Amino acid sequence: QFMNKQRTLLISSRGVNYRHRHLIQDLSGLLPHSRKEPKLDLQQLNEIAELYNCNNVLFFEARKHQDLYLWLSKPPNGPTIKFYIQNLHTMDELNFTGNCLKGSRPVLSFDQRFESS
RNA sequence: GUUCUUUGUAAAGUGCCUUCGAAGAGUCGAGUUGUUUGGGAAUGCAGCUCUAAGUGGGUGGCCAUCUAAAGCUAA
């Protein structure tokens, strides 16, 4: 079979938007190994990881229809990156032209600077 | 203002003490199709398939604030 196996739970908070909903569209369709769930304090998530039996968890917070915090972990052990997003450009813009076949596994470019911390 | 009628163990009020002490469901809410929103898009609504709780629930930053699903009301 395969060495690497993941599944990710997708749940955001209440007070959704088209910035939000556009994002859950993209990211939900981007993770073919992910499970997608209704939206919902801080405890129950790792337990939902027990119910749907999921090894990757993330969460989208909405404060005043502004603050989007992404909580990030792999339950129950995590650890978590609490996160905040700004200047969101989803896939849905006119100047992003793409049409992508579904479910693919990308290739990730990233900088070597990360390891510096 | 004058005058008549006041009635029956008739109401009501205030404080202290003792026993008690109910709070609105096809709703709320969930997914979705529309529709609108300057509110960022269901924000609000309508439809559909599903549909709760009682130291609860809503809304918002451990905390604060309020009590939905019934109703009247002059300037």
Curated annotation (Swiss-Prot):
Subcellular location(s) per record: Nucleus, Nucleolus
Q: Which domain of life is it from?
A: Eukaryota
The record's family statement is: Belongs to the BRX1 family.
Q: How does it assemble?
A: Part of a complex that includes BRX1, RPF1, RPF2 and SSF1 or SSF2.
Q: What else is known?
A: Present with 13200 molecules/cell in log phase SD medium.
Its function, per the record, reads: Required for biogenesis of the 60S ribosomal subunit.
Name under which the protein is recorded? Ribosome biogenesis protein BRX1
Which organism's genome codes for this protein?
Answer: Saccharomyces cerevisiae (strain ATCC 204508 / S288c)
Q: Which gene encodes it?
A: BRX1
Q: Which residues of the full protein are shown?
A: 26 to 146 of 291
